[PDB]
C-alpha cells in the first residue's frame, strides 16, 4: 500500500465529468475542476488541464497524469505551508500518507486550519488526535473516508485500507 493506491481507493476513477461529494464538477481520480455550478466552466477547466478540446471525457492515461500532478501538488502544498510542514516532518511514512490524503481532499488551507488536531499529531497523542479529528465538518460529510484516514493516524498502519 502507498499514497497513490490509498487515494485511488478513496477517490475512485471516472473518465467523464461528474460531481464529487460536495456537488462540484470533478473528473478522473478525484480531480476537482471547479466549484462553479456551470458545466461549461467545468469543461473549460478540463480542456485547459489536459491541453486539448475534450468532450468532457478523458482517457485513463490522462486521468493518471492529473493524479500524479495532484499528488505532487498536495505534497508541495504541505511542504510550503508553515503549519503543515512541521507536522509532516514529525510523522512516520504511513501517517505522512494520511496527511497527504487530507490535503488532496480539502486543500492546504483547509488542513492547515486543523490547528488543534495538528498539534496533537505532532505530540504523537494518537487516540486524542483521532477523537479531535472526528469533531469536524470533514468527518461528518465523509465519515467512512474520514474514519479510514483517522484510523491510519491512530494506528500508523494500513489496516483501514487492507
Swiss-Prot record:
Alphabetical UniProt keywords: Antimicrobial, Bacteriolytic enzyme, Cytolysis, Glycosidase, Host cell lysis by virus, Host cytoplasm, Hydrolase, Viral release from host cell
Main location: host cell
S-S pairs: none
Outcome recorded upon mutating residue 117 to F: 10-fold decrease in enzymatic activity
Signals that turn on the gene: Expressed late in the viral replication.
InterPro entries: Endolysin_T4_type (IPR034690), Glyco_hydro_24 (IPR002196), Lysozyme-like_dom_sf (IPR023346), Lysozyme_dom_sf (IPR023347), Phage_lysozyme-like (IPR052619), T4-type_lysozyme (IPR001165)
Cellular compartments per GO CC: host cell cytoplasm
Stated consequence of mutating residue 30 to F: Almost complete loss of enzymatic activity. The enzyme is destabilized by 1.5 kcal/mol
Subcellular location: Host cytoplasm
Transmembrane segments: none
UniProt GO molecular function: lysozyme activity
The protein's Enzyme Commission number: 3.2.1.17
Chain residues that bind substrate: 32, 104, 117, 132
Biological processes, Gene Ontology terms: cell wall macromolecule catabolic process; defense response to bacterium; peptidoglycan catabolic process; viral release from host cell by cytolysis
Effect upon mutating residue 11 to N: Loss of 84% of enzymatic activity
Annotated consequence of substituting residue 11 to A/F/H/M/N: Complete loss of enzymatic activity
pH profile of the protein: Optimum pH is 7.3.
Reactions the enzyme catalyzes: Hydrolysis of (1->4)-beta-linkages between N-acetylmuramic acid and N-acetyl-D-glucosamine residues in a peptidoglycan and between N-acetyl-D-glucosamine residues in chitodextrins
Catalytic site: 11, 20
PANTHER family: T4-TYPE LYSOZYME 1-RELATED
Function: Endolysin with lysozyme activity that degrades host peptidoglycans and participates with the holin and spanin proteins in the sequential events which lead to the programmed host cell lysis releasing the mature viral particles. Once the holin has permeabilized the host cell membrane, the endolysin can reach the periplasm and break down the peptidoglycan layer.
Annotated family: Belongs to the glycosyl hydrolase 24 family.
Protein name: Endolysin
Native species: Enterobacteria phage T4
Gene: E
Amino acid at each position: 500500500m502507498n499514497i497513490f493506491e490509498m487515494l485511488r481507493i478513496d477517490e475512485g476513477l471516472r473518465l467523464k465529468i461528474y460531481k464529487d461529494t460536495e456537488g462540484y464538477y470533478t473528473i478522473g481520480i478525484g480531480h476537482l475542476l471547479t466549484k462553479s455550478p456551470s458545466l461549461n466552466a467545468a469543461k473549460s477547466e478540463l480542456d485547459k488541464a489536459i491541453g486539448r478540446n475534450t468532450n468532457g471525457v478523458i482517457t485513463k492515461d490522462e486521468a493518471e497524469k492529473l493524479f500524479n500532478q495532484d499528488v505532487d501538488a498536495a505534497v508541495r502544498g504541505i511542504l510550503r505551508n508553515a503549519k503543515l510542514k512541521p507536522v509532516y516532518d514529525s510523522l512516520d511514512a504511513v501517517r505522512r500518507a494520511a496527511l497527504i490524503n487530507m490535503v488532496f481532499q480539502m486543500g492546504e488551507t483547509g488542513v492547515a486550519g486543523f490547528t488543534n488536531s495538528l498539534r496533537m499529531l505532532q505530540q504523537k497523542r494518537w487516540d486524542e488526535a483521532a477523537v479531535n479529528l472526528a469533531k469536524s465538518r470533514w468527518y461528518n460529510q465523509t465519515p467512512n473516508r474520514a474514519k479510514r484516514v483517522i484510523t491510519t493516524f491512530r494506528t500508523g498502519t494500513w489496516d483501514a485500507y487492507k
